[PDB]
């Protein structure tokens, strides 16, 4: 269907795509912002370990 009617906003969503089945019941919000949030929350202990020492 594409963004032909509505689209992820530019500054609010730096990039990436969202893929959802019919009726939008199941959605996989695979955008770059969410990817960064997840990787940040996962790698935070490494960040703390490297900030010290």
């Amino acid at each position: 269907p594409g963004p032909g009617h509505h689209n992820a906003h530019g500054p609010s969503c730096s990039g990436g795509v969202v893929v959802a089945s019919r009726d939008g019941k199941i959605v996989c919000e695979n955008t770059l912002d969410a990817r960064l949030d997840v990787v940040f929350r996962k790698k935070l202990p490494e960040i703390r370990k490297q900030l010290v020492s």
Partner: protein, 463 residues
């Protein structure tokens, strides 16, 4: 490393009933996966997926099912069990039931994410508690003592000062000193406490100046009932990180364990599980094990987790399922009597039902005196005989107390008067108290004493 994945957000919520939220068409669920539910209004709340069958999922929301629409709410599957971001910096702070920092402070920067309900310690690697503790109260230390790694609760009915006793113990907590970095760090769980009690705890802890070494996990009665179950889990997980993974001994405290029992009962009744005695869940023994059965000392590490729960007999009955199972699991009891409170005694510790199953190892020659065991046994056993004499006097008369029974009655009177009573801030040392304990045992003749040998106390000398 395996590439990351963004959590799938579902909207196929197809049923709500009680505290359980049903889902359908779930693509690859995971048991006990934490799911945070976003309602149509936009507010968010957490929840666990209790039962996973086929492509369905029976989620138990935390903040309550109210406001969930079967066609506007969205559920996000994080794909990982509940984990508490434990860190050494967490010391000296206050957290909500789930762990939200409520001291107007920045959130915890985790040194490591650790899953709650950690695996058991291999009992081959498990060791035995071998050191006494200086809490700061006479009667607990002198008789039915507490070892650095021993679990033991406080039995005390509603309205009794057990909260004040817990606060005094936490503020006066310290090692025997017979070091500050490894000194007692206190994790203070608070399951289902009143708001006034919460403010009292905060003010008392801030006043003693030991905020630098005490963590509060406050969970008020206003908070959701399910969120109270995870508070002891989080507290014990943080204690495990502090003790085993950092070294310092932890003195875990949980108030109102009966509130935790009530939370378990409510959650079980919600899901309609098989009921044990008094309608409690049939697995309450296992849950109370997973809470209590973590105190101990691990061989390869210098840490130690000492557990001091605080129960409350609902009907002031020891036979209630919660205290009964606790006594099955908790390796001893320190008992508090309402009858002694009726006599205006500030620390109403009744010693007749109070015994420490690990006291036989806390005592010895490295600490205390060589007459500790026998003196404790005598002041434990002659109290029962004094009570029997009092009952006989009540049912017969004052003339029933013979030349022997009257001695037991006087022993009971002096024991309840001088020995048990103590100051609200008195750090009565063991030897100074053991001298008066010997005097109490010596009220009875030095030859009628059956269990104790005369030589044991004879090694010690008065004055």
């Amino acid at each position: 490393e395996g590439t990351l994945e963004v959590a799938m957000e579902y909207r196929t919520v197809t049923g709500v009933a009680g505290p359980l939220v049903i889902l359908d068409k779930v693509k690859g669920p995971k048991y006990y996966e934490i799911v945070n539910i976003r309602l149509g209004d936009g507010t968010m709340r957490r929840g666990q997926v209790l039962e996973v069958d086929g492509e369905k999922a029976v989620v138990q929301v935390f903040e309550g099912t109210s406001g969930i629409d079967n066609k506007f709410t969205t559920v996000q599957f994080t794909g990982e069990v509940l984990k508490t971001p434990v860190s050494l910096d967490m010391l000296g702070r206050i957290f909500n039931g789930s762990g939200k920092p409520i001291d107007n402070g920045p959130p915890i920067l985790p040194e490591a994410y650790l899953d709650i309900s950690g695996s058991s310690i291999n009992p081959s690697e498990r060791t035995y508690p071998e050191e006494m503790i200086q809490t700061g109260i006479s009667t607990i230390d002198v008789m039915n003592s507490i070892a650095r790694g021993q679990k033991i609760p406080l039995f005390s009915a509603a309205g009794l000062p057990h909260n004040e006793i817990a606060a005094q113990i936490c503020r006066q907590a310290g090692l025997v000193k017979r070091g500050e970095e490894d000194n007692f760090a206190i994790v203070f769980a608070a399951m289902g406490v009143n708001m006034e009690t919460a403010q009292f705890f905060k003010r008392d802890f801030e006043e003693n100046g030991s905020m630098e070494r005490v963590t509060l996990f406050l969970n008020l009665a206003n908070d959701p009932t399910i969120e109270r179950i995870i508070t002891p889990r989080i507290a014990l997980t943080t204690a495990e990180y502090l003790a085993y993974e950092c070294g310092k001994h932890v003195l875990v405290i949980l108030t109102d364990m009966s509130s935790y029992a009530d939370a378990l009962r409510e959650v079980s009744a919600a899901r309609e599980e098989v009921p044990g005695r008094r309608g409690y869940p049939g697995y309450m023994y296992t849950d109370l094990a997973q809470i209590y059965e973590r105190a101990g000392r691990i061989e390869g590490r210098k840490g130690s987790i000492t557990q001091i729960p605080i129960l409350t007999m609902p009907n002031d009955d020891i036979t209630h399922p919660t205290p009964d199972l606790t006594g099955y699991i908790t390796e001893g009891q320190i008992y508090i009597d309402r009858q002694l409170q009726n006599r205006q005694i500030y620390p109403p510790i009744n010693v007749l039902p109070s015994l420490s199953r690990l006291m036989k190892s806390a005592i010895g020659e490295g600490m205390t005196r060589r007459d500790h065991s026998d003196v404790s046994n005598q002041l434990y056993a002659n109290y029962a005989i004094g009570k029997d004499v009092q009952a006989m006097k009540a049912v017969v008369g004052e003339e029933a107390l013979s030349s022997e029974d009257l001695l037991y009655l006087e022993f009971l009177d002096k024991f309840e008067r001088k020995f048990v009573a103590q100051g609200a801030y008195d750090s009565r040392n063991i030897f100074q108290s053991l001298d008066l304990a010997w005097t109490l045992l010596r009220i009875f003749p030095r030859e009628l004493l059956h269990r104790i040998p005369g030589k044991t106390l004879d090694q010690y000398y008065s004055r």
